Amino acid sequence: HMFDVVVIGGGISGLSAAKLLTEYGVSVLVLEARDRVGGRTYTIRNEHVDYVDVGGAYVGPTQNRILRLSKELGIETYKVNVSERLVQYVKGKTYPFRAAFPPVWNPIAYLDYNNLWRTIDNMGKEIPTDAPWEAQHADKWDKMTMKELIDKICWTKTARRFAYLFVNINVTSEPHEVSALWFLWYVKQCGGTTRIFSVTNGGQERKFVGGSGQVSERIMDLLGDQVKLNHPVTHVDQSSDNIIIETLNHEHYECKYVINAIPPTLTAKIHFRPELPAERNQLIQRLPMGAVIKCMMYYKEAFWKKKDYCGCMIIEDEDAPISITLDDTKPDGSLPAIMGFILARKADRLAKLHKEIRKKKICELYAKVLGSQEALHPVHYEEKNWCEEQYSGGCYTAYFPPGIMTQYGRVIRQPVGRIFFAGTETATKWSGYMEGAVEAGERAAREVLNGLGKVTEKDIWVQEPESKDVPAVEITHTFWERNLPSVSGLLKIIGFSTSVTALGFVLYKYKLL
Ligand SMILES: Cc1cc2nc3c(=O)[nH]c(=O)nc-3n(C[C@H](O)[C@H](O)[C@H](O)COP(=O)(O)OP(=O)(O)OC[C@H]3O[C@@H](n4cnc5c(N)ncnc54)[C@H](O)[C@@H]3O)c2cc1C
Ligand SMILES: COc1ccc2c(c1)[nH]c1c(C)nccc12
Ligand SMILES: CCCCCCCCCCP(C)(C)=O
Ligand SMILES: CCCCCCCCCCP(C)(C)=O
C-alpha cells in the first residue's frame, strides 16, 4: 500500500497525471470514488444508443492536449453536423441562419450585438491568463456580476437576452451568479467569443468516435491495477514524510506526493491534515458547480435535415425546457438524435419534474422549433442530471461568484506542502473542458516530477504543439466588426455629424465654405 504518488480522482485530469507519472517510472495510485473512471465524461453503452456521451463530448481546434491524448490512445474525432441551417428560436419564432451567431437585422441592435462580443474579447485582453486577479481592473470587475456588465454594455434588450443566454451556455449558470472578471477570463482562456461559441473552428467542432469516456477507460487500461474504483478519498494527512490517504471504507494508502484531481467543492469535503491554509479553505468551499441536464432524444430519421436544419437550435425562451442543442446522429447517419442541454436555473426547475414529463416537454419544444410533428415521436430518450452527481457537483465546471477571485482566487492551483492540485478548474487554457483537465493533470504531474528531481522548473509548463489533424484556423473579424461603433459610439459621432452639418449651414448661409 506504499506509493510515490496518490492521485485523488480518476477523471481525465487524474488519469492524465497518472499516465504521465507512470511514463517516468513513478509509482502512482489513482483512487477513484465511483465504479468507473471518466468523471464528468461518461459514455453510456446500450442497444438503443450504441454509445452516447452523457457528460463532456466536444473537442475542437486549439484543444491540442485532449487531441494529442485522444489520438495516442487510438481515438478519433468526427465533425458535429452543421451542414444544414442552424436556427434561433426567440419570441415564439424560428429563425434559420448559417453563421456562428444568430444574425441581427436591426441596425441598432446589430451595433449593440457587435459591440458586445468585441468588448467581451477586448476586456479579456487586459486579463492575465495565469493570473486573472492581477488584471489592471480586477477588483472593480470581480465585484460586478456578468449581468451588471451585460446591462452596462448592451443598450438593446435583444443583445442582453442573448448575452445572458451566452453566459448560460458557457458556464451553466445565471449572469447574476458569476463574477464578470472570472467570466471575461473564462472566455479569454478559451480563445475568445467566436472560438468558444462556434462549432466549425470552435469548441463544439468535434466529437470522439465511440465517445469521450474512452479517453479515461483506456488510460485506466494502461494503468491496470494502479487505478482503484469505489475508493472515495476522505482524509489526507501530510504530517509525516509518508502522507497517509484514507478512503471511505477506511483503507489506507501512503505516498510521498498527492495530486488532488477533483473539483473544489469535493476538495472541500476532504479532511486535510494539517488543515489547508484558511485562504485555500475559503476558496474551495466558495466555488459552486454550474448546472446541466443533458438530454438525448432519438428518432428513426434525422427529420430536421430534410427541413434543412442541422439540428442546432439556440432556444432563447424562458418557458422552454432546453437552451441549446446539437445533432447527435452517429457519424454514419445511424441513430439520429438531438443532444439537448437544460442549463442554469432552468435545469434546477426542470429537475423537479418526472423524466417522462421532462421528455414530453422537450419533444413539444422540438416540434415547435423544427416545425415538425415527427419530433413528438422519439424512439428513445436518455437523460443525465449532473447536479445530482455526488461525485461531480454539477457541470460543466465550477463558477466564480463575485469577489471570490480577488479575495481567494490567487491560490486555485498553489501546492499545499506536498499536495498538488489538478482538475480542469486549475487549468489556464480551456479550464472547464476536457482540454483543461489534461493540462492541469499533466502540469501537476510535472510539479510532482520536479519534486522528485526528474523534471526541471522550466519544464513544469510545457507548450502543446498544435494538432496536425485539427489545426486552429485563426480567428478573423471583418473590417466592420473591428470598426462599427457601439450604440453610444454612434451617438458621439451623430452629435458630431449634427454639430457640423449645422455649422455647414451657418457657413453656407454666410458664404464662408
Ligand atoms: C453534461 C456535461 C457536458 C460537458 N460538455 C463538455 C464538452 O462538450 N467538452 C469538454 O471539453 N468538456 C465538457 N464538459 C466539462 C468536462 O466534462 C470537464 O471539464 C472535464 O471532464 C473535467 O475533468 P476532471 O478530470 O478535471 O474532472 P472530473 O471529470 O470531475 O473528475 C473527477 C474525478 O474524481 C472522482 N472523485 C470525486 N470525488 C472523489 C474523491 N473524494 N475521491 C476520489 N475520487 C473522487 C469523480 O468520480 C471523477 O472521476 C462537460 C461536462 C458535463 C458534465
Ligand atoms: C452554438 O451551439 C452550441 C451547441 C452546444 C454547445 C455550445 C454551443 N457551447 C457549448 C459548451 C460551452 N459546452 C457544451 C456544449 C456547447
Ligand atoms: C446606422 C446603423 C449602421 C449599422 C448597420 C448594421 C447592418 C445590419 C446587418 C448586419 P448582418 C450580420 C449582414 O445581418
Ligand atoms: C455605415 C453603413 C453600414 C455598413 C454596413 C454594415 C454591415 C456590414 C456587413 C456585415 P460584416 C461583412 C460581417 O462586417
From Swiss-Prot:
Record text on subunit structure and interactions: Monomer, homo- or heterodimer (containing two subunits of similar size). Each subunit contains a covalently bound flavin. Enzymatically active as monomer.
Function summary: Catalyzes the oxidative deamination of primary and some secondary amine such as neurotransmitters, with concomitant reduction of oxygen to hydrogen peroxide and has important functions in the metabolism of neuroactive and vasoactive amines in the central nervous system and peripheral tissues. Preferentially oxidizes serotonin. Also catalyzes the oxidative deamination of kynuramine to 3-(2-aminophenyl)-3-oxopropanal that can spontaneously condense to 4-hydroxyquinoline.
SUPFAM superfamilies: FAD-linked reductases, C-terminal domain (SSF54373), FAD/NAD(P)-binding domain (SSF51905)
Required co-factors: FAD
Keyword Oxidoreductase recorded: yes
Primary localisation category: mitochondrion
Catalytic activity: a secondary aliphatic amine + O2 + H2O = a primary amine + an aldehyde + H2O2; (R)-adrenaline + O2 + H2O = (R)-3,4-dihydroxymandelaldehyde + methylamine + H2O2; a primary methyl amine + O2 + H2O = an aldehyde + H2O2 + NH4(+); dopamine + O2 + H2O = 3,4-dihydroxyphenylacetaldehyde + H2O2 + NH4(+)
Tissue expression pattern: Heart, liver, duodenum, blood vessels and kidney.
Protein name: Amine oxidase [flavin-containing] A
Keyword Chaperone: no
Keywords attached to this entry: Acetylation, Catecholamine metabolism, Disease variant, FAD, Flavoprotein, Intellectual disability, Membrane, Mitochondrion, Mitochondrion outer membrane, Neurotransmitter degradation, Oxidoreductase, Phosphoprotein, Transmembrane, Transmembrane helix
InterPro entries documented for this protein: Amino_oxidase, FAD/NAD-bd_sf, Flavin_amine_oxidase, Flavin_MAO
GO cellular component: cytosol; mitochondrial outer membrane; mitochondrion
Sites of S-8alpha-FAD cysteine modification: C395
Organism: Homo sapiens
Annotated membrane topology: Single-pass type IV membrane protein
EC category: oxidoreductase
Phosphoserine modifications at: S372
Disorder noted: Brunner syndrome: A form of X-linked non-dysmorphic mild intellectual disability. Male patients are affected by borderline intellectual deficit and exhibit abnormal behavior, including disturbed regulation of impulsive aggression. Obligate female carriers have normal intelligence and behavior.
Residue numbers on the Cytoplasmic membrane side: 1-486
Signal sequence, start to end: none
Mitochondrial intermembrane topological domain: 508-513
